[PDB]
Design a protein around this ligand. Structure first.
Ligand SMILES: [Zn+2]
Length: 256
């Protein structure tokens, strides 16, 4: 069972993790290719009613929320997706833990919403195929006040503190966990960021962050336990070389 960090490498057990087009990456906005074909993201069905409830589980590597059928996400013509699940990556006290970085800057945490192309019917069919999976990624930053949407999930972490434990949470507005600016993002082709590291994943990284209180960020990083009896912390993969890939930007960066 793979773990975050070390020692031992990931490719010893999962060779595809040594592929050339892996995620996450460092984003350098002044060097991204401006692409006016990248239009605002379109989501539908993300505002869920309270019932039915959704599964929330500590899998030892993250906390993962299973999404119900019917959430649709469109990256552009020919690029339509159904949402499957979301999960988080974080650091520890006084240490950030986002997966993507911007000019080498690491943010406190990161949310990933994983989607399946409408071209397939099962995740296993889509693994490794160009565009088969798409992930929406947003950075979580510290703001002054409590984020009410995130509190619906963060208040439930204590009951799933032990690795492998699960609970049920009321339906909520999944789009309220994401930034409000759907027009400004970066996009590139990469991989799953855990084994088996399958390539072909379309990554979309919002430029705008979401704000959580200091207490909420502490709740996220300090509540859960992983394998053995190590704290579930620093659960992010190191950034990977672009190897000639171009990151596109849906907007002009771009001055400083
Ligand atoms: Zn992830």
């Amino acid at each position: 069972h793979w773990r975050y960090g070390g020692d031992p490498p990931w490719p010893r057990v999962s060779p595809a993790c040594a592929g050339r087009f892996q995620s996450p990456v460092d984003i350098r906005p002044q060097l991204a290719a401006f692409s006016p074909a990248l239009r605002p993201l379109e989501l539908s069905g993300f505002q869920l009613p309270p019932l039915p409830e959704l599964r929330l589980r500590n899998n030892g590597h993250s906390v993962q929320l299973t999404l119900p059928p019917g959430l649709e996400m469109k990256l552009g013509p020919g690029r339509e997706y159904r949402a499957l699940q979301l999960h988080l990556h974080w650091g520890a006290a006084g240490r950030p833990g986002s997966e993507h970085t911007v000019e080498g800057h690491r943010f406190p945490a990161e949310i990933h919403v994983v989607h399946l192309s409408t071209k397939y019917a099962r995740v296993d069919e889509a693994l490794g195929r160009p565009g088969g999976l798409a992930v929406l990624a947003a950075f979580l930053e510290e703001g002054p006040e409590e984020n009410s949407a995130y509190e619906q999930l963060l208040s439930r972490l204590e009951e799933i503190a032990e690795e492998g434990s699960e609970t049920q949470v009321p339906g909520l507005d999944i789009s309220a966990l994401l930034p409000s600016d759907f027009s400004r993002y970066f996009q590139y082709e990469g991989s799953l960021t855990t084994p088996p590291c399958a390539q072909g994943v379309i990554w979309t990284v919002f430029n705008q962050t979401v704000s959580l209180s200091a207490k909420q960020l502490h709740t996220l990083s300090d509540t859960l336990w992983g394998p053995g009896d190590s704290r579930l912390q620093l659960n992010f993969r190191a950034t990977q070389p672009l190897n000639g890939r171009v990151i596109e930007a849906s907007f002009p960066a771009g001055v400083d």
